[PDB]
RNA sequence: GGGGGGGCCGGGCCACCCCUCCCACGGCGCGACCGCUCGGGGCGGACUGUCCCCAGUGCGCCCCGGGCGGGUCGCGCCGUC
């Protein structure tokens, strides 16, 4: 250690950079999954 | 004599009447740029109805189309003791 301490941090640039993170939802996405439920209650249980 | 008056000048500057330019402002007309927000396609991918297709919603980017619109810039015409 004490004849060569110095780093040399490893060289990085390869990444095709994808996204396996899973994305915040807009707002008319959320805005439709109501009113999209309450016509899937709505038509089921007007059956039954 | 007094009073009154006409004069005796060339020149233009301003500018009435006939010509022709440079700006400013407006209007109308067109052109370019920026913007908003509406349609078709391509890709990324959300949600549910639907077995899917499709339907309803609609997000990221790329390619095309349309409607309105403020501002900026460019041009065309009409108006302005």
Same mark, same amino acid.
């Given at each position: 250690?004490?004849?060569?301490? +110095?780093? @040399?941090?490893?060289?990085?640039?390869? +990444?095709?950079?994808? =996204?396996?993170? =899973?994305?915040?939802?807009?707002?008319?996405?959320?805005?439709? =999954? +109501?009113?999209?439920?309450?016509?899937?209650?709505?038509?089921?249980? @007007? =059956?039954?």
């Amino acid at each position: 250690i004490r004849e060569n301490p +110095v780093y @040399e941090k490893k060289p990085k640039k390869e +990444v095709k950079k994808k =996204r396996w993170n =899973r994305p915040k939802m807009s707002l008319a996405q959320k805005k439709d =999954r +109501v009113a999209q439920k309450k016509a899937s209650f709505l038509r089921a249980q @007007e =059956r039954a």
